[PDB]
Design a protein around this ligand. Structure first.
Ligand SMILES: Nc1nc2c(ncn2[C@@H]2O[C@H](COP(=O)(O)OP(=O)(O)OP(=O)(O)O)[C@@H](O)[C@H]2O)c(=O)[nH]1
Ligand SMILES: Nc1nc2c(ncn2[C@@H]2O[C@H](COP(=O)(O)OP(=O)(O)OP(=O)(O)O)[C@@H](O)[C@H]2O)c(=O)[nH]1
Ligand SMILES: Nc1nc2c(ncn2[C@@H]2O[C@H](COP(=O)(O)OP(=O)(O)O)[C@@H](O)[C@H]2O)c(=O)[nH]1
Ligand SMILES: Nc1nc2c(ncn2[C@@H]2O[C@H](COP(=O)(O)OP(=O)(O)O)[C@@H](O)[C@H]2O)c(=O)[nH]1
Ligand SMILES: [Mg+2]
Ligand SMILES: [Mg+2]
Lengths: 104, 426, 428, 102, 426, 427
């Protein structure tokens, strides 16, 4: 027997990227928005960031910290950070991140 | 605009064409009733290359079957997408050749080839500007090889300025159907070196090898092999039917691949090929395609390309891909294994990109490599031919019908000098 | 002041599809073709009322990309009679494109361009867009250039040609095609501008760091370059130079017209946010080989004459200062015969953005167009790989069966040798 | 795939900052929007805001010898300030015409 | 960036690799179905060193499992984290070596090594910047030792500039699992000394003694032993996978621990290993880790290192710690027991700190000591080899396959000169 | 006036992470990059309300660099200057000088080119490197060589991290140290040694932190650097530029190795304890219990000293305190130099860092002197280097990379000649 069905949806390059530039830029850049540079390469990270995107104090603190917990969705969370994971760079910049969050 | 007419010869050609028209009709979105049922408007734009509308959206293939035994006809009529064809194009004998090339080229041709030439004419002038003709056939059978190669000669006599593709499966001693396979294949290619524009060399041995290793199927029935070659032929003409960032029609594919008029024997491979278990554990990138393209376990001929050198090679790509990535990949593969390529031609790889992948896939490719490794296959057949010709076994069924000995000797001579020029350019 | 644009080839019309999008976005014209509420007069003629049609002809042999254009959103910009489409493609065959199908298509092309020029009034010149590697843009491009030279002759023809890169290539017989194209590109066009593809790949890898660039970003940046070149006609500047100025100030000898292009700053959004943008560093950035449109090393070459278009917020003081710094530096070296090797020009309007583009809105931009001997190097690099394949008579039979002979092959080879000799002489 | 047309990474992304959708990312040659320096250094190669053109410095107003910079005229002043100025100088104009000119 | 591809040979190599990819998967927070579900994205930034993304976040280990008996593969696919391997990477023979180095090096290698070389090559150029290879195998068995040995030679012949780890288990007389242990072990190291960059020697006796004394566990199955060795291997590669205050890569540790090209055999110890009942009563400081590191009953080899001298040593720390305390602890242990170290090299200890501890621990440490006590083990092997070779017992099974006598003599010679230079530097 | 700073190696950029943190906190620049003229020497005013620094971090392993790329200072440094290789040099001077340098130094210097063309009144460069590692030493030296052939006449302040005598984390760092000095000698202009054991002792003794990490070390090192550039950055009663170090501290072209020291290293509570004035801090900047290099300056004679003062300081008392120093006999000077002091007074007091262990003080002193105690240090390195090289240990790594014994012997004898020169000048 024949395969059930397969819808045809792939558009051509011309239509795709030199006629729908305004929607295309939006979609592409909204896939990879919250993720940091070294983290945005992997696709599971983009999916995690999307489910995450879908407290303003916590949000400002996040976007200040940068790499602390973009892909979060055992280990319970403290008010400031996670128990097991504390890098020396973050330990050095805790106060600057806090001041930045307060100013934001 | 550019036009391709299809001719199927013999049982293998018919069943191959059957799966082929099922695939193409699926690609262009016409159900086996012949009506249009596609959704995207990209499908209509280039269906004149393969179809003619008859009455009120009834789309029919620009195809011509040709054989001598009605079993194949009932076989192609029984399956789905069987009643979409042309009942008048079912041009067809009644006696049957019986794997006798002399019967396929002298006896039944004298009363069937006028008729096929009549209908192929009607089909040719029905369209405005031909691009080329496309013939699917074997080289072992009688009604496929003999009738096919005479049809090729007559057509090249009629229309000389048109392109010509021929997909011919060649026999193997490991996969050997008949005993007269060298008797047929030797004379067949002897006509193909002078008549056809270019061919695509296929064989069933490499296909079974693929279904063993990369597909890991248990029962590779003929429909599976035929489904493979159909995907190959869909790939080779995806450039005409769909716009790309870099288009490569049949003629410039030919002019890029053929450096000398007698050197027109190609091997072909397809990607991607994954088992349903390993289908989840693989990536879909250009390097993922290239590492599988240039694998010697993917060529659909029985010729290890590392036993010789590549003269030219082509990579047709389907899907929205990075051209820079395509180019650096082809450059890197050419510079890494620089021994397997020819020296006196720079940039041996012609590449092209189409923006339409096969249905349901994300990105695909088709490799057409004009190597010198095919001379092993021609020696593989020529030595058997001389072994039988040394004491004229099975010769008399050919002699008593009208064929003489000098045809055989001229076939051997042409075999010897084509492998001689292959070895010369190696 | 009017100038028309012809596109010969698969690559030429993609460059044009980029360029005309850019031009409409610059002049505020919606894709329907009207201005919602005079500078446009150099590209758009106003038919009747509320319409603006380009002064352009796309022409091609295979109809696929042309009717893709026809079916796109720009149906209303070009109505269907200027877009010339043949029935079958030249298929990377210079002979087939110059003799087989050119003979049927060039007469239509030329008696359409005649009425275009007649509709025009003060025609400055023509500009052609092609890639010499293909078949169409090679053969019929040369045929069209020859017939335009015999029709007009005294009008300047800007050929923005795309050459094959040394190591990166998509065809096989493009050496043959390029040799046969250049044989007539030498003596027909007036000002020829080279663009390779590997240089733009390197640019988009380094500065814009798009790791998987398609052809469209290349074409967008080429359109930006063309727009910067023609902004002098389009908008009034503090120091304006027209198309006759390249003819005059850039071509020291009637056979030496091959110009290397460079553009700056090719910069992203936050990279511009990062970089303090001024004139001195962009005049610098216009000169390193990591920002040229041609894969060549001008350190080995000596400049003959350079031209610098500036667009945006640029005063003459700092551009004079930067040119003085450049002339005093010894990392690059101008040719002795020319004392004063610079030609500046300044224009008030900044280069615009294109949505879906990769560049942000920039205060100021520089387009450098220079003459050197890296081009004579490039031509010998091409000649070597042409001769390599020609020594074995490879692929010669296709051209011969089309109907050409060994004579034109040998004479184009010796013409390229003559050009090499010319360049090694002028570099003295 | 995602990284097809755009750079897609955080340090090189083409997406501008949501604070300002349109602004030319560069240094204007006039520096019209910068806090004025408290005291301009002796060596100052850059200009901030309103400096009189040559057409004016070649032929100055009469209050230029007294020490009044030309920006002091063009600077905005409130109504009580203008009233005190016209009362300090001997203009002696009535409040009606004052309000009219105001 | 820097890439580590994995190789597993033989039954022990497979089971060790299984536990290894279990703990690494748990370390990076990926589920046994192959999808990320962890907490900190510090896990994400360096999963490319061990994984490749297939389709929608399907991270598969960049590993190659290889043996000759399917029961090992079944035991691999049985347990969890067995459905995350790419089934193409299960390159696998069918006949079986059976504790014969000749079968594993001349007979079965002739038809398995080109296949594994195909797979490892494709796995090598799949990534960009190779750091090196990581091998887990044995020296007593046949299909692991011999096949892996020949594979190491081929790989080092193809890629001379990449690093190489070899975790090899050696036997002991007390725990003598098979009979031809010296016959295989001698030949294996005789090849390792010229092929491998460095070798981390293991054994089961030291593991049993460790679970005896420190762990106080009742029934130590192989799983816990492989769990310990796995914890060791995660510790040795922690520097690449996580940021720290002082990172020491693989090549960095090799250049600090290898003063002479033939002196590249290490002994390993892991801390902290404490019983559960006594886990509550202890503090967790650097001195607490130091007292357990330098305990001679904590090495993973049957060579009590205080019977010789440490040439060089390295400590890999994980956890937020004071670098001052780290160094003064190293200075103290180096100043007090000064006779245990070599004299003509000052500062015999290379230290490194990483900020992320292994899951469930506060502060851990991995010790790698290049000491000359290992020559006791090799002499302990060579005397058994000579005792057997004098009588030529069990030798016909080797000479009847293609091996000759001079290979054994050169193994004796290289064994003897190695222990001679070890005794020299002592 | 501008000065740019390059950071080589894993140590240098950690120093940069504390250094630039202190600069932005000093000029009031938030990590996002904007203030809510003194900044001009370190930050270029890009765009509108934005300042980017004049530095290049460079390293071969990307782990520490991309940690900076994704930390809190993502918007301050835009990652175009943060150069990063693909793989480490792995404590191998040869690997970091010939194999990987030949691909990274060019990219570094054609980035530093257009940085220098951006600057206008460039004073000089200042380098941060650790000579114990592979990357900092190898391509660090290589970069310094190509810097010298590019500009030459411009000053270069090298702040190096030498290995400690007994406290050590590496093994082959003697080899890398000696191979660094052979080029550090004739390429750097002004070299400042800083060691780790001395700073460990300072933080243990004065700061009473029983368990310090590299962070505290890098924090007070940044305090030293900022204190020695504060003269350029802010106006003082008597300020001195970068050129004065070369003039007032470099007697001869091959004697440029300066001891550094800082006072007062005082915590928050000890500031409540003690009264901080100029006399006691001028004294405290001379004890070996407050030096940045573990060596005994009593064993040597001080050829020339430099005192940077920050805060509430009048020229009267600083001249009185230096008088007492000149008349004290516990520390002896060299007979040839009669006037061996170079003072400098700046008004702005040093700043604090939240989370830093130092308290704010009225005034602080950064002493930079030149002695012969360094002549003791290099001989101490020379001894343990020959101890290893006598047995030809670890040499196969270097020659396998492609080097030979030639530069080994010539760097060994170069330190020997430097030893004889210091012994001769101590006369
Ligand atoms: N810059 C740029 N070059 C292109 C583009 N598309 C194709 N090319 C170049 O064009 C060359 C081949 O010629 P094409 O333009 O593809 O086709 P053609 O010139 O019309 O010749 P035919 O294929 O025979 O029709 C290739 O070497 C490409 O480098 C493009 O979109 N941008
Ligand atoms: N004072 C101080 N020294 C440091 C710091 N970090 C690393 N070091 C020194 O750096 C030396 C080792 O070199 P690294 O900085 O780790 O790296 P490298 O110099 O680039 O050499 P490679 O390891 O090969 O990359 C050690 O001797 C440490 O003393 C730090 O934060 N402060
Ligand atoms: N791929 C493929 N090959 C076929 C099929 N049927 C027959 N062949 C090949 O055809 C060859 C024999 O040709 P034959 O059937 O006698 O051709 P005919 O008698 O002229 O129609 C054999 O070598 C087969 O490999 C098929 O369904 N698929
Ligand atoms: N730690 C550990 N060691 C093992 C395991 N299986 C086997 N070994 C060791 O490996 C040696 C025998 O290896 P063997 O199975 O014969 O290797 P192969 O036959 O070549 O695959 C014995 O000395 C065992 O100590 C295991 O699961 N864990
Ligand atoms: Mg074309
Ligand atoms: Mg390092």
């Amino acid at each position: 027997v024949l395969p059930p069905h397969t819808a045809f949806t792939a558009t051509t390059t011309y239509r795709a990227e030199t006629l729908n530039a305004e929607p295309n830029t939006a979609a592409i850049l909204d896939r990879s928005q919250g993720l940091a540079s070294t983290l945005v390469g992997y696709e599971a990270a983009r999916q995690a960031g999307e489910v995450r995107r879908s407290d303003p104090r916590a949000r400002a603190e996040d976007t200040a910290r940068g790499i602390g917990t973009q892909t979060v969705l055992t280990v319970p969370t403290k008010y400031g950070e996670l128990p097991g994971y504390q890098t020396t760079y973050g330990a050095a910049t805790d106060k600057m991140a806090r001041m930045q969050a307060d100013n934001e | 605009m550019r036009e391709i007419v299809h001719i199927q010869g013999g049982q293998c050609g018919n069943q191959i064409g059957a799966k082929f028209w099922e695939v193409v009709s699926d690609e262009h979105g016409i159900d086996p009733t012949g009506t249009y049922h596609g959704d995207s408007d990209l499908q209509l734009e280039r269906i004149n290359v393969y179809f003619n509308e008859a009455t009120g959206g009834r789309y029919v293939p620009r195809a011509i079957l040709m054989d001598l035994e009605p079993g194949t006809m009932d076989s192609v009529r029984s399956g789905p997408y069987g009643q979409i064809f042309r009942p008048d194009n079912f041009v067809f004998g009644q006696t049957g050749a019986g794997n006798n090339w002399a019967k396929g080229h002298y006896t039944e041709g004298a009363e069937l080839i006028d008729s096929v030439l009549d209908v192929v004419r009607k089909e040719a002038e029905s369209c405005d500007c031909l691009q080329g003709f496309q013939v699917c056939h074997s080289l072992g059978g009688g009604t496929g090889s003999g009738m096919g190669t005479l049809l090729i000669s007559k057509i090249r006599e009629e229309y000389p300025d048109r392109m010509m593709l021929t997909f011919s499966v060649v026999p193997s001693p490991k996969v050997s159907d008949t005993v007269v396979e060298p008797y047929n294949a030797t004379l067949s290619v002897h006509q193909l070196v002078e008549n056809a524009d270019e061919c695509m060399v296929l064989d069933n041995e490499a296909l079974y090898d693929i279904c063993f290793r990369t597909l890991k199927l248990t029962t590779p029935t003929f429909g599976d092999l035929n489904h493979l070659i159909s995907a190959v032929m869909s790939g080779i003409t995806c450039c005409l039917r769909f716009p790309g960032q870099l288009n490569a029609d049949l003629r410039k594919l030919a002019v890029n691949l053929i450096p000398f008029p007698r050197l027109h024997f190609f091997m072909v491979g397809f990607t991607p090929l994954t088992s349903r278990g390993s289908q989840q554990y693989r990536a879909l990138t250009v390097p993922e395609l290239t590492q599988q393209m240039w694998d010697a376990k993917n060529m659909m001929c029985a010729a290890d390309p590392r036993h010789g050198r590549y003269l030219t090679a082509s990579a047709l790509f389907r899907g929205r891909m990075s051209t820079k990535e395509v180019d650096e990949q082809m450059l890197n593969v050419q510079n890494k294994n620089s021994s397997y390529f020819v020296e006196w031609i720079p940039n041996n790889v012609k590449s092209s990109v189409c923006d339409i992948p096969p249905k349901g896939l994300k990105m695909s490719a088709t490799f057409i490599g004009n190597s010198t490794a095919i001379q092993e296959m021609f020696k593989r057949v020529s030595e058997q031919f001389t072994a039988m010709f040394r004491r004229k076994a099975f010769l008399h069924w050919y002699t008593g019908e009208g064929m003489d000995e000098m045809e055989f000797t001229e076939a051997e001579s042409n075999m010897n000098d084509l492998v001689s020029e292959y070895q010369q350019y190696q | 002041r009017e100038v028309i644009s012809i596109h010969i080839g698969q690559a030429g019309i993609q460059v044009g599809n980029a360029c005309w999008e850019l031009y409409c976005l610059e002049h505020g014209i919606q894709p329907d073709g009207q201005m919602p509420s005079d500078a446009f007069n150099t590209f758009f003629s106003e038919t009747g009322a509320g319409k603006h049609v380009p002064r352009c002809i796309f022409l091609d042999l295979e109809p696929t990309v042309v009717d893709e254009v026809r079916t796109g959103t720009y149906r209303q910009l070009f109505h269907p009679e200027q877009l010339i489409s043949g029935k079958e493609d030249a298929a990377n065959n210079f002979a087939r494109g110059h003799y087989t199908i050119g003979k049927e298509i060039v007469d239509l092309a030329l008696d359409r361009i005649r009425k275009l020029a007649d509709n025009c009034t003060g025609l400055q010149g023509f500009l052609v867009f092609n890639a010499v590697g293909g078949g169409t843009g090679s053969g019929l491009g040369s045929l069209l250039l020859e017939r335009l030279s015999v029709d007009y002759g005294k009008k300047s023809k800007l050929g923005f040609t795309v050459y094959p890169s040394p190591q990166v290539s998509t065809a096989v017989v493009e050496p043959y095609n390029s040799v046969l194209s250049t044989h007539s590109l030498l003596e027909h066009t007036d000002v020829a501008v080279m663009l390779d593809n590997e240089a733009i790949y390197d640019i988009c890898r380094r500065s814009l760091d798009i790791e998987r660039p398609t052809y469209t970003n290349l074409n967008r940046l080429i359109a930006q370059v063309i727009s910067s070149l023609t902004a002098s006609l389009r908008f009034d500047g503090a120091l304006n130079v027209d198309i006759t100025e390249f003819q005059t100030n850039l071509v020291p000898y009637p056979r030496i017209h091959f110009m290397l292009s460079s553009y700056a700053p090719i910069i992203s959004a936050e990279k511009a946010y990062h970089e303090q943008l001024s004139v001195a560093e962009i005049t610098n950035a216009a000169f390193e080989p990591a920002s040229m449109m041609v894969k060549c090393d001008p350190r080995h070459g000596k400049y003959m004459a350079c031209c610098l278009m500036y667009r945006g917020d640029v005063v003459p003081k700092d551009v004079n200062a930067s040119v003085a710094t450049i002339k005093t530096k010894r990392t690059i070296q101008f040719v002795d015969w020319c004392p004063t090797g610079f030609k500046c020009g300044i224009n008030y309007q900044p280069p615009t953005v294109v949505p879906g583009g990769d560049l942000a809105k920039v205060q100021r931009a520089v387009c450098m167009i220079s003459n050197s001997t890296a081009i004579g190097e490039i031509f010998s690099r091409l000649d070597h790989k042409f001769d390599l394949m020609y020594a074995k008579r490879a692929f010669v039979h296709w051209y011969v069966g089309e109907g050409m002979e060994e004579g034109e092959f040998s004479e184009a080879r010796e013409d390229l040798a003559a050009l090499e000799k010319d360049f090694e002489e002028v570099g003295a | 795939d995602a990284d097809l047309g755009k750079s897609l990474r955080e340090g090189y992304r083409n997406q501008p900052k949501p604070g300002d959708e349109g602004r030319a990312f560069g240094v204007p040659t006039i520096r019209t929007d910068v806090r004025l320096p408290r005291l301009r250094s002796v060596a100052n190669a850059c200009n901030y805001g309103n400096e009189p053109d040559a057409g004016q410095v070649l032929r100055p107003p009469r209050a230029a010898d007294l020490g009044i910079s030309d920006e002091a005229f063009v600077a905005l002043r409130p109504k009580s300030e203008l009233r005190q100025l016209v009362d300090e100088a001997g203009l002696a104009l009535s409040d009606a015409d004052f309000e009219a000119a105001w």
